[PDB]
Amino acid sequence: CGIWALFGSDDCLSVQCLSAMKIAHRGPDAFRFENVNGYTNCCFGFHRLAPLFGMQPIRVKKYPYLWLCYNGEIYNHKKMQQHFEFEYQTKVDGEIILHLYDKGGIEQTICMLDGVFAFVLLDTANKKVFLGRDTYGVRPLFKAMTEDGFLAVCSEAKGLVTLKHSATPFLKVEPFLPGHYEVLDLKPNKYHRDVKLFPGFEIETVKNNLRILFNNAVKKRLMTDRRIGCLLSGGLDSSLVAATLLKQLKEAQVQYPLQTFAIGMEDSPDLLAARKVADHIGSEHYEVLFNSEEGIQALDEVIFSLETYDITTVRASVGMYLISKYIRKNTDSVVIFSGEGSDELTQGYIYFHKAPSPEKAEEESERLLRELYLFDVLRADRTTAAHGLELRVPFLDHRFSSYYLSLPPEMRIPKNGIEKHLLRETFEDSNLIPKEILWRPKNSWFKILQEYVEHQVDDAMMANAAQKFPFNTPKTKEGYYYRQVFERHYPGRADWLSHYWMPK
Amino acid sequence: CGIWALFGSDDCLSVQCLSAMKIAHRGPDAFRFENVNGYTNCCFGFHRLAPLFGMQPIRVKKYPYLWLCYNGEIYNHKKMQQHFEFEYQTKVDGEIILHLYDKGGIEQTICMLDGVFAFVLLDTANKKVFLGRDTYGVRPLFKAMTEDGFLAVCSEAKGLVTLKHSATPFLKVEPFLPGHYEVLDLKPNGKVASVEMVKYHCRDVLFPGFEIETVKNNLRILFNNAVKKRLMTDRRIGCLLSGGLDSSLVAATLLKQLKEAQVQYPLQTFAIGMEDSPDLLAARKVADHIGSEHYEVLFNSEEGIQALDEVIFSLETYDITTVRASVGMYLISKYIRKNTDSVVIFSGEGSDELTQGYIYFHKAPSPEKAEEESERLLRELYLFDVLRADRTTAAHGLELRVPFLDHRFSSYYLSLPPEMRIPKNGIEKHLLRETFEDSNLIPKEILWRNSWFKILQEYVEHQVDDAMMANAAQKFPFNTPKTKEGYYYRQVFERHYPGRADWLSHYWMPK
């Protein structure tokens, strides 16, 4: 599902459609263009992931002036549909936004939606254009605004770089800040409540709350029509996500068995851990093995899709891209789960042990969560959706994450040299994951890629590098090659990334 | 209202979109692209004129696998919904076709529409593609077929020449023959093969035998019913009062039925002519008699010379009798779109040729030859007369209606014995004049009854000399231009559309 909205375009629309047919890998089944009546300059375009209804440029009979296109999914449409007695003409849940927009405006329609979305709304009655995204950064949105009044919104930045505006030579294609709603006036030519839970912060009665929130998040994420698969990396996060996923699937009476996917190098502890978790839970495990040649040949397309030039979200996105391609090739599991967003929410990184104080620990956790739409969610989203797959994060929801971050700073920090202590303790007695893998906190792929970079980039151009790439100069020979590929693909658009990756 | 289908493609679908926008002037209000699910190679496209309801690529709930895209209006839709007890999810006129296609196949969905229609239908369940056009041809449809399974259908040929197909050097864009429906097999990769193309040529929804004083009553009833049924329109209706008898009667009957139906807006006529021309005076006389809103348009020579290029680009023909009368129609249509808010025009085009209405028809060797010539020239109406009346009108977002070409009236007129249609007392179209003599629809002075081509000839002579005409025999091998005017029109047409001259075969005047 990919959206593309244009407003104020003056260089026709036939020559400006080539950008739209570049995010088409998000949904390869359907495709639709539209023009806002009376606003021929404005145009809409959608790509759908697979029979009759589902075309995103919604224009209902009750609200003829509301044109909404959203490339996400909201998990709380049933509750408000029953509670607010709202009738939906179509089968798409996103219409509820319209049924809320006429109710209390944009603040009420954006702040009462459980799920991940990125929506563009046009209201000709009051002549207003609204743009919206999620609290954390999933379902990416990118906007380009020329001073004259040009508006260009695309799910991925590949649909705006090729856009041509003759008014000004350069258009600034910037990522949309995650938690924000933008309201603009259409000329003729922060919001980061949606709601069992035991009050108090006692240690015994906090595990119940955490488990309830995690189970509710997983059950809410079950809302789909395609198959559900899980990426079984091997760590604690994805292991518990898969365990709870299959438990709810058995509870929900789902015919197809759960399908876990694990990408790894030959004879690695991570792959063995994934196999062990799959064997204990009892799912269908697919053990993808990747070599150096495929990972090297995928660097160009990984950089093209991820739209980044870092050294941490392009060194782990290769495996995710390969496993997504394998899933699309030899599996019908469209909807995919992932444990991403769980090792910074509860301070799971290696460098969180060297913490000057717990206050700085949760401050850094919040800072990392705010900048999650460029480091971790980007890798798990662009690579996944480049193969016609839909990502779901069972850990990064609005309620469980807020409760975890609202907890006392003393509980989140590791206490016995083992990270994620509270998460490990909460589900220890549930027997969801074997004690060998739930406990025991924590492959030669970086070295071979570095040796490839040494044979690709030279040594003299390394010293005289920080004038070819002035902003965010690369340091190592690997980041320089990533930046070179990014510049060859997207020229001069290096302002998307501000800082590479700063562990303390 | 412009349709566009691209069944079969290999050169992406975004570099092949400019052709779709090349015909966007038909309706400049909306424009939708669509890709058929499971057949991402084939793509649709519409350009609608004049709110929420519309978007002609219909996909009804009851027929999820049927995708229809049509240009035109089906006038007998209120007599089919009740009779065939067929519902309608959308307020679109053409949806009825889909229902009929599920009732009696394609033959029963084509020989039951008493209107004008050029439609593309796709049925992915049986993997079939259907094309179609009117019996007479007042709806434009052009098809481009490549053997590898490429079927590109556009309302005007300006939306097919730009289309690019690799693995094939030349793409043949040809007009679709009216009265034909082309069943096509859809291979499971987007390619299209041809299986059938057969002619098809509805009265179930006061008709005595043949005799004088009775045939006139039948003609009166048929013409009145045709105009009344053609009144179905959600926007303003304004007749083109050229000054001739056909347009005069059309406008008079239109005003009578509008007054009968209690329409708030007053009928407005529209005439274009040179200074103090007798045709303009006759049009003013008719407008004064019937009590209408006449907006005469005076067009100068320079405007015609400037609009020659645009009229050749739009009319898509290089005749000497078509782009010589389409200049005035184009200018008047521009005037109507600019300084008036009438979008539906009930022109009298397609009348004289139906009822023996030309100067040479006087010297007919025999009545049988006269009626055969009338039928032949009326069958070829999609290149000479209707083309000028339709392309020029639609180039400014205006719709065309031709009440004289309705199936019932024309069929009855041509079923008449030949000795009644023939000129009788040295006049043209005697029976039509007598059929409305006592109705007082049009005054007796005009019912009972040129310095434009000289500037064109002199401008062509100044532009094109005899040096080019000394080699025009080999410069244009197919349908060589004889006169200088034809030479200049052909040169402009070839500059606009290169090497596509198979559209026209003959010009005029079969003495």
Numbering used by the authors:
A (entry chain B): 1 to 50, 54 to 192, 202 to 204, 207 to 209, 220 to 466, 478 to 539
B (entry chain A): 1 to 50, 54 to 204, 206 to 209, 221 to 464, 478 to 539
Excerpt from the publication:
Single-particle images of unmodified, recombinant human ASNS (apo-ASNS) were collected and processed using cryoSPARC62. Data processing (see "Methods") eventually gave rise to a map with 3.5 Å overall resolution. First, two monomers of unmodified human ASNS in the native state form a head-to-head dimer as a result of intermolecular interactions involving residues 31–34 in the adjacent N-terminal domains. The antiparallel orientation of these two peptide segments places the side chains of Arg-32 and Glu-34 in monomer A so that they can form salt bridges with Glu-34 and Arg-32 in monomer B, respectively. Moreover, Phe-31 and Phe-33 in both monomers form a hydrophobic cluster on the other face of the dimerization motif that likely contributes to the stability of the dimer interface in water. Second, the EM and X-ray structures of human ASNS both lack density for residues in two loop segments (residues 201-220 and residues 465-475) and the C-terminal tail (residues 539-560 and 536-560 in the EM and X-ray structures, respectively). As observed for the X-ray structure of DON-modified human ASNS, the intramolecular tunnel in the EM structure adopts a discontinuous, form through which ammonia cannot diffuse. In our overall EM model, Arg-142 adopts a conformation in which the side chain blocks ammonia access to the tunnel, which we therefore designated as closed. In the fifth PC (component 4), the side chain adopts a third conformation, designated as partially open. Closer examination of these structures showed that the carboxylate side chain of Asp-405 formed a salt bridge with Arg-142 when the latter adopted the closed conformation. Based on these findings, we hypothesized that Arg-142 might function as a gate to the ammonia tunnel thereby regulating ammonia translocation between the glutaminase and synthetase active sites.
Here, we use human ASNS, a Class II glutamine-dependent amidotransferase that mediates asparagine biosynthesis, as a model system to evaluate whether EM-derived maps can provide insights into conformational changes that might mediate function in multi-site enzymes. As in all other glutamine-dependent enzymes, catalytic turnover requires that ammonia must move through an intramolecular tunnel connecting the active sites. Human ASNS is also of considerable biomedical interest, having been linked to metastatic progression in breast cancer, sarcoma cell proliferation, and decreased effectiveness of clinical treatments for acute lymphoblastic leukemia. Moreover, ASNS variants are strongly correlated with impaired neural development in children, pointing to the importance of gaining an in-depth understanding of how single residue changes might affect activity by altering the conformational preferences and dynamics of the enzyme.
